[PDB]
Amino acid sequence: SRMDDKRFNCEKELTLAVIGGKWKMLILWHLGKEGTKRFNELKTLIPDITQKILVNQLRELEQDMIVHREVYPVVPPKVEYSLTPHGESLMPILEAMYEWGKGYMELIDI
């Protein structure tokens, strides 16, 4: 696994290691609330990300068994990304963080 080397003082740090990476929560959000997307579709939904980084974050999310990757032997190539059942289990946490973020922004910019 990715986290075989790491030493944690809490299982929460492990969750953070799965979703903490720079763009991962944005990726997981789009896949969990819009279903399956091909690579170039994710890249258009996330314009500021570079190609090497988008694939890297997707690969780490796949090694963590959070994201499923499906390659089809077609021309032009076709690769689909979607959430695994464990990825789906991460959605309640992501939603909680979305609502907490909205509530936090209210109080700091008034």
Place this chain on the structure above:
Amino acid sequence: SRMDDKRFNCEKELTLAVIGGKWKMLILWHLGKEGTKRFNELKTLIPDITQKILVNQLRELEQDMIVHREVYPVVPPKVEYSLTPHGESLMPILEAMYEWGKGYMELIDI
């Protein structure tokens, strides 16, 4: 605000900005589940952290309005750290990450 210089694609990225720092979730966990802790008491609870990093994360959490800092004019000095109501509202997310983390920790090592 700490976040005046930062740009986000989601409100979840804001929550992550608050709690994602290297030792922050641990510190919030101790404060929310064991109450107030003095500086050296926290340093004892987290033996690996250095004093410079501990004060840094506490200052950021304070500046994010998550942690309260109380200084007493006594000898020896006495500084108490605790959760503000916004910090306490973060605990459900931390507990949800704790439970998700232990379930993940058991599944991948199967």
Place this chain on the structure above:
DNA sequence: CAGTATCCTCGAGGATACTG
């Protein structure tokens, strides 16, 4: 379309000595 291949920056985090 959906990837690979190289090289590099920068700032979060750290070791240690000192101190009001």
Place this chain on the structure above:
DNA sequence: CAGTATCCTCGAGGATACTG
């Protein structure tokens, strides 16, 4: 006790170019 003052490490993320 609760921190500062110096100097330093290191790797995630990014710039930039190529491709089956």
